[PDB]
Design a protein around this ligand. Structure first.
Ligand SMILES: COC(=O)c1cc2c(nc1C)[nH]c1c(C3CC3)cccc12
Ligand SMILES: COC(=O)c1cc2c(nc1C)[nH]c1c(C3CC3)cccc12
Ligand SMILES: [Cl-]
Lengths: 337, 336
């Protein structure tokens, strides 16, 4: 019952971004469970307190809403839950087992965060209006808040999956990008054929510059790449099918996977009639949008990547996921506090 | 000795952005309009020049350009009380605009010289980069706005084609002109050049030729710069290879937007270096170089509510899209 002092103390501590290589040494063996416990009990309240302090600095008109009070109550409970293990001994295996259950329960509280935050934005539009300045402030915090949420849940999933009894938790060091593209297409195809009476076909063209025709693989979180590519397929298929409804030919959703010296780019092109440039900004705005696209961009940025969209009204749209090719360059992108 | 006084009066007035329709819409009318509007657009940018820090404002290039803008401002003020109905008054006005245009011809290399002076004198810091980028975007855009007025007046009033504006601007014709020019330059230096492929996508009127109302001279400069960088990257990347992949272009006509995508296969670029292609400072150094006329090219696009964007995939190639307003109703001057 001392959360305000806990937030002030740990807000001074800066978050600690981690590279892809560091995640592997932690998950290299089950013997590293103690080192992960001693690190996570310190780092988790730092990331919580930093965003929690940013949450409290919000204006009271936003902070006083029931949606914001609920999420802040979850962060406080999980913060106080993690701080019970600060005084415990890592050499006791029971202390380690209790921490995992705590982390699994911490996630269960924050499962419905994105739908909850979407309610507060809709409440804001109908109570205070949807003006450009309100969008910039809502975009600024939610990107940082969700980027903090992506970073925090990343740390939890690695410990629960590794320390349970080829894939290092949620990270696949031999991640076949084309297979993840095909999997995201297959899920979108299933939804497309149920909603519509057709589905665009898939085309993939890999471009390995240094090793032409060799399969392109990287070190990444495939669950993140699936989330980004899947949200892109749903948009490409919706526009492609609805644009060619009076037409018989259904163009394919062509994809390209280029492996450069630094970038691993993943372009997805449709022919859904495209979008005017005026409305491209609207697709990434939380208030004006239906958050799979901005959240997908955060997954890209989370490891120094990016996700960009460029369209041609009357023809179609192209979307490129930019990922760091090297695991060295793949480092956590956290909100600057 | 009232140059600061003249700047204060007309700087108070905000510039009036004009539409493409207004440009189509007589020398007395343009004479009376420009003698008010020109000193207003000069005063606003000359105001921001003095807002610069002492590091930049004290440079010889800045003070040199100020001498042209000050001298150009004073040239317009003689005609404030003159007679529009006098043909000698109107002719002197038209003659006065040509010298001001020719006076400011060496502004871009002069301003480019000042950036190099700052890079070597104070270093390449992020804060000065954004300020130089923020300032040069507004200064060069003001230069385009002023030249557009001067060219429209001097060319219309000489004593189907409205000066610099082509109401039936076939976009693919301007693309071929810029390509053929860049190809000859590519052939002269590299003794080789990629081939061009053009496609058109008229959504509202299939198979109708894509025409618009635009300034083809501004459109030629943008496409010319893009080909020069696409040809170099395609050539230099395939110097050991035999086949040069072609430079493909598409022209889409939507309900409101007219887009122009250009695509090469010059091995693409990392995402980190895309910023420096549009930066004045990082493109500035002691066919064309990668990112030379590209900052100013993006300004020509935004001058009528357009934009210019680059998207590259390292190991493959690069895409470049020019977004333009299809309708002259939405084509309006973006003024600082
Ligand atoms: C007004 O938004 C739209 O109607 C709209 C939106 C998208 C679209 N096509 C249309 C007509 N393709 C998209 C894509 C594909 C992979 C390249 C991604 C995200 C949104 C869209
Ligand atoms: C260091 O920048 C470069 O070397 C560089 C620059 C460009 C490029 N390819 C490379 C390797 N294509 C370009 C294009 C074409 C139409 C798509 C336009 C402008 C610059 C580039
Ligand atoms: Cl000038």
């Amino acid at each position: 019952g001392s959360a305000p002092k806990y937030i002030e103390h740990f807000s001074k501590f800066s978050p600690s971004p981690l590279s892809m290589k560091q995640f592997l040494d932690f998950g290299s063996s089950n013997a590293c469970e103690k080192t992960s416990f001693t690190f996570l009990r310190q780092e988790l309240p730092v990331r919580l307190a930093n965003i929690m302090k940013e949450i409290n600095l919000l204006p009271d008109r936003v902070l006083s809403t029931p949606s914001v009070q609920l999420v802040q109550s979850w962060y406080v409970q999980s913060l106080l839950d993690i701080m019970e293990f600060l005084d415990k001994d890592p050499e006791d295996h029971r202390t380690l087992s209790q921490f995992t259950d705590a982390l699994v329960t911490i996630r269960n509280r924050h499962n419905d965060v994105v739908p909850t935050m979407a309610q507060g934005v809709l409440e804001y539009k109908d109570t205070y209006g949807d003006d450009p300045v309100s969008n910039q402030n809502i975009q600024y915090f939610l990107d940082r808040f969700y980027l903090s949420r992506i970073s925090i849940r990343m740390l939890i999933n690695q410990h629960t999956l590794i320390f349970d009894g080829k894939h290092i938790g949620s990270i696949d060091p031999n991640c076949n990008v084309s297979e993840v593209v095909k999997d995201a297409y297959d899920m979108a195809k299933l939804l497309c054929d149920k909603y519509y009476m057709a589905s665009p076909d898939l085309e993939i063209q890999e471009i390995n510059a240094a090793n032409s025709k060799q399969p392109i693989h990287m070190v990444y979180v495939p669950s993140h790449l699936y989330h980004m590519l899947f949200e892109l397929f749903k948009n490409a298929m919706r526009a492609t099918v609805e644009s060619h409804e009076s037409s018989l030919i259904l163009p394919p959703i062509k994809v390209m996977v280029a492996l450069g010296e630094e970038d691993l780019s993943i372009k997805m092109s449709d022919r859904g009639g495209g979008v005017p440039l005026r409305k491209i900004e609207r697709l990434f705005s939380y208030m004006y949008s239906g958050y799979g696209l901005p959240i997908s961009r955060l997954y890209a940025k989370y490891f120094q990547g990016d996700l960009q969209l460029f369209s041609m009204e009357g023809f179609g749209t192209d979307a490129v996921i930019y990922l760091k090719a090297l695991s060295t360059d793949s480092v956590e992108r956290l909100p600057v506090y």
